[PDB]
Amino acid sequence: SITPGTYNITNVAYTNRLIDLTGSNPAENTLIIGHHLNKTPSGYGNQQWTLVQLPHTTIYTMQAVNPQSYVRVRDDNLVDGAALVGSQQPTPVSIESAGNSGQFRIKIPNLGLALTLPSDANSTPIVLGEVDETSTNQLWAFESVSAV
Amino acid sequence: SITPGTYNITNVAYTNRLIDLTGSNPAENTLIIGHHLNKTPSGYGNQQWTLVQLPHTTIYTMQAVNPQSYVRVRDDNLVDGAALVGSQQPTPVSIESAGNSGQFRIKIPNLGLALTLPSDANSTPIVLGEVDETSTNQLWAFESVSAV
Ligand SMILES: OC[C@H]1O[C@@H](O[C@H]2[C@H](O)[C@@H](O)[C@@H](O)O[C@@H]2CO)[C@H](O)[C@@H](O)[C@H]1O
Numbered sequence: 670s671i672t673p674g675t676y677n678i679t680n681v682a683y684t685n686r687l688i689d690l691t692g693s694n695p696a697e698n699t700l701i702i703g704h705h706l707n708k709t710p711s712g713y714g715n716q717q718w719t720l721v722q723l724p725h726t727t728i729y730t731m732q733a734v735n736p737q738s739y740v741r742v743r744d745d746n747l748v749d750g751a752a753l754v755g756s757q758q759p760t761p762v763s764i765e766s767a768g769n770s771g772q773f774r775i776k777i778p779n780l781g782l783a784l785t786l787p788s789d790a791n792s793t794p795i796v797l798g799e800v801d802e803t804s805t806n807q808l809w810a811f812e813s814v815s816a817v
Numbered sequence: 818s819i820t821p822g823t824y825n826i827t828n829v830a831y832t833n834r835l836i837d838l839t840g841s842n843p844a845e846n847t848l849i850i851g852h853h854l855n856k857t858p859s860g861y862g863n864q865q866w867t868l869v870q871l872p873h874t875t876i877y878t879m880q881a882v883n884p885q886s887y888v889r890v891r892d893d894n895l896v897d898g899a900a901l902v903g904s905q906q907p908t909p910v911s912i913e914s915a916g917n918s919g920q921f922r923i924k925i926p927n928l929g930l931a932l933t934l935p936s937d938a939n940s941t942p943i944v945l946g947e948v949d950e951t952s953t954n955q956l957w958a959f960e961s962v963s964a965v
């Protein structure tokens with residue numbers, strides 16, 4: 670399984686789009702979106718995500734570097750089409766390899782729903798969609814940030 | 818939520834029945850059962866269960882003190898009636914306060930299923946049942962293992 674640490678997370682369909690917390694805003698219910706890299710080499714703190722793992726499982730929490738907001742499904746509403754947002758409390762996710770190449774799905778445990786990016790337009794919000802075998806817009810690549 | 822540590826776990830419908838790994842057997846797919854207390858004051862290692870928590874959530878793993886088998890649903894088959902067993906790999910569980918006191922429900926994350934004891938007969942297997950907030954057969958009392 671993926672090592673605990675800090676990462677930039679890029680979409681497999683749209684390789685110019687990173688997971689991004691809108692405006693670096695710390696407020697409840699701030700939207701999580703797909704957006705162009707915002708500074709070289711590894712973005713500002715709203716494009717860097719720290720993973721904490723439950724040992725001997727694929728269950729994690731995800732938290733931005735600055736401001737320190739967790740990934741959550743809005744209103745804990747675990748259904749097709751619901752928004753992803755920043756919050757003071759996390760939704761637990763299952764991060765699972767999709768084959769022998771470095772790609773992953775980010776799933777809601779036991780429900781057959783996953784994070785998806787529905788267009789390449791800059792600033793498109795990320796939402797839940799149905800799990801399947803062939804859509805590339807629900808696959809994601811992880812690159813370590815050396816930080817410091 | 819409940820503090821990480823090592824516990825005896827007793828049913829609320831049937832207060833003479835503890836969670837027990839059959840015969841202290843380390844083999845894969847050994848049944849987990851309700852059974853009378855097998856040693857004073859706190860049982861042998863097959864009646865003592867260690868909890869590890871994912872921070873800022875109610876998600877845990879459960880593992881016996883001796884032999885070191887995890888709690889798992891047989892074949893990862895998350896349906897009404899399925900068997901609980903000992904294994905080298907865990908099923909993640911959501912442990913939540915209920916009823917009233919040092920009383921808790923042991924639920925499958927995001928599904929309407931929970932661990933239940935259907936009879937007071939000695940050595941009855943523990944299985945999944947539908948969530949029902951009025952049923953004492955799916956409520957459990959947690960007591961820390963004394964410090965010899
Ligand atoms: O609109 C999404 C992008 O916002 C950028 O931050 C802006 C911000 O939206 C605006 O309100 C103001 O504060 O200027 C900022 C730029 O200096 C983020 O930097 C970008 O990553 C997107 O989230």
Ligand SMILES: OC[C@H]1O[C@@H](O[C@H]2[C@H](O)[C@@H](O)[C@@H](O)O[C@@H]2CO)[C@H](O)[C@@H](O)[C@H]1O
Nearest residue numbers: 837838839840841852855861863864940
């Ligand atoms: O039958 C369930 C109980 O088994 C007990 O272990 C017995 C075992 O069944 C028996 O075959 C033989 O090995 O002697 C053991 C007693 O030392 C457990 O001790 C009890 O907790 C139940 O699991």
